Ligand binder design. Sequence first.
Ligand code: HEM
Ligand code: HEM
Lengths: 83, 55, 73, 378, 89, 100
Amino acid sequence: ADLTEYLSRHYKAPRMVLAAAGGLEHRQLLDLAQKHFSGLSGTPTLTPCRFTGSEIRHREDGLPLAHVAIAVEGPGWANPDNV
Amino acid sequence: LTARLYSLLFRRTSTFALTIVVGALFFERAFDQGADAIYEHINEGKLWKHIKHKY
Amino acid sequence: GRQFGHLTRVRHVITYSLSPFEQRAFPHYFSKGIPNVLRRTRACILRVAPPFVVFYLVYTWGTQEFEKSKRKN
Amino acid sequence: INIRKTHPLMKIVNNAFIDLPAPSNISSWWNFGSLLGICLILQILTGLFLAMHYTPDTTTAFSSVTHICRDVNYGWIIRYMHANGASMFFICLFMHVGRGLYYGSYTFLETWNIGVILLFATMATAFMGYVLPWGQMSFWGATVITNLLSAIPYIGTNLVEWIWGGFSVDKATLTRFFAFHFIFPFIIAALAMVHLLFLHETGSNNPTGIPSDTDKIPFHPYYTIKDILGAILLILILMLLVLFTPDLLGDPDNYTPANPLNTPPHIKPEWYFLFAYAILRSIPNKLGGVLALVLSILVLVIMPLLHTSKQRSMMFRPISQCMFWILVADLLTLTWIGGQPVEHPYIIIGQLASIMYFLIILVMMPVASIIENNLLKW
Amino acid sequence: KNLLRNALVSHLDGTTPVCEDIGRSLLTYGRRIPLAEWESRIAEVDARVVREVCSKYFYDQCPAVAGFGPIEQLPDYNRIRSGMFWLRF
Amino acid sequence: KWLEGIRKWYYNAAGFNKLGLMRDDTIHENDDVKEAIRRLPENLYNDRVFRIKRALDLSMRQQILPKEQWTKYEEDKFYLEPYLKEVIRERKEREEWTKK
Ligand code: HEM
Ligand code: HEM
């Protein structure tokens, strides 16, 4: 029931992109979109998430090597500072 | 106030040390005046400055 | 006794550790420190105090014995 | 690579103060190492400046220290810093010893032996520094303890005539004691480095007694700023002592020129020797009393060799803990009885307190340990 | 900058990374930015702007550290915090 | 016998139950204790060091556990004792063989 509810809510109207790259025709691509994806007839998220900044550590000495990562909060997408 | 203060005086070490030395001299001056005023204030009377002011 | 790397062999442990700027300077000082120090005080009353009241009783006893010896003559 | 891991002095700095795996369980009762070290270097500085204005002679010492406290700028507070810093050093030394006995860290054997030798050296340095101001109290106490060293049959008479330089405490004795108090804290610092060497061989101790090798936090910057906190607490207590009540510790008779005839009736050593002195005058035997003092320090040697428990500390042995607190009260009892004139009820309770001291530390510790032992299905 | 050019060019070879790039560009932006604008913004880069941005996103942050395994040698979090900002050594 | 009640009073007044510890935790370490700890299965060893590190944290911060998680006199799963018996008996075996 929750699976049907999830599939019915989190997919439908604005939030989907068909993309085609390679040896085809864009006109016939939109024609096939008209042929099949038309009539889908669909009809409230993205809050700022608080970055904590902390340290988790798994002392687990059975394995030979060691794996250490360290990160900070990344800026995102709308900045050339990302470049 | 706090954001301005951190964005100015807490990102270069040598400028931080210089401004705390300058503020340390200013605070030393202000503490001289305050401590001397208080200690002369709670023991008025029997102090040598007024007995010299007699003469 | 040596440096790190060779001391113990422990699996099965995950430690969470919080940033110092994340949390407060004084997290619930008065609502915790007073009952904790009351518990640490009650945990040592009959072990620490009964030597000192023996000290004060022998103090007053020997003192008043000296006074009684030095006030009849 | 890393400058700290390449330079040979910086390798010593890294192994001493940075990469030392420390127990995360230790409260303010483990700050005493930094406290004693900062007390030691401040004693070095104060005694150094005093020696820049002190005259080691019987005629000139009293007048010269008077010239220091009245004429040389801040010499009055530097003298007060030296004496009261000796007292604060003694407080921290006793509580360092009390931690080392309470938390079972005395199982470290040779480290305990190095500490015993350090205790000898600090006692000798303290006594000769107290002799130096050429006071009435210092003169008579030096005469008494010199005769205590003459208690030894057939060796002590030649040894005391060897340390005199005369018949009594004269200028030779004064200058020799100046030399020994003037040289000894360097040797104290060297044996302190040896003390630190054997501890960093072993590793430090937590309140539980279980080794904290799974929970080692570094020595820096946690314990560095915690020792700074404890050190500035020592600074404020010591400096408020030297600037508010300088006379709560110092004897009144210490400000008198030495009279070679008087023997004032409240003659006593200072309070950090009165428990050493209360054992003496409550035993009617000269050699017996000084042997009782030497055997008290040898009991402090012995107590690592009688840990017949199965825990390390007395943290979970409350009976031995209560006996330890009775010993704390008995130590302060002996110190106060050392601070009293010779009186008959005081004589009775001083003898009872000294024999109680011996019976608690010698006899009652394995008895309490074996009751705690056999009580726990062992 | 030449490494970033060559990495992006060899990244977008074939058809799967190209179509993935189109999908991810039109999800984050609603539109696709071709690589010539990326080349112009590469030409918009000198070391001064780089150290400004690295001063923005590194200089005394509160990072997230994850350790996995025999990580006894891994220092405490305050060692990372001390070695994070230079005091110019 | 009432000595069991005396042991109950002692185990109340000890505090490692309040810290949530067993009897096989606070043994003083000689090398025989080291051998006895080395002669243990992996699961009990890891549970023991987990208990030790939780106890060291709750001893540093001193915020000691609620009443409910405290171990009791009955459920004290003491296990190091027969291993300690075997280690000390091998040590007495070696001492007797040298003094024979
Ligand atoms: C002469 C003065 C002394 C100095 C400067 C000194 C110095 C130190 C230092 C720096 C430490 C390491 C940090 C600490 O826990 O305090 C230490 C630890 C220790 N000292 Fe001393 N010490 C002195 C006297 C003594 C004496 C008289 C004893 C007793 C024999 C002693 C026994 C110990 C023990 C057992 C430890 C380790 C305690 C632990 O692991 O927590 N020390 N000392
Ligand atoms: C090598 C360094 C030291 C030097 C050069 C030194 C020098 C002196 C001098 C010249 C005096 C006589 C002046 C006076 O009494 O104010 C003195 C007294 C004294 N010193 Fe030191 N001293 C040193 C270290 C220590 C240490 C480490 C202690 C013990 C903590 C100590 C304890 C005392 C005491 C108790 C007195 C008697 C204080 C008084 O009666 O006024 N000294 N010292």
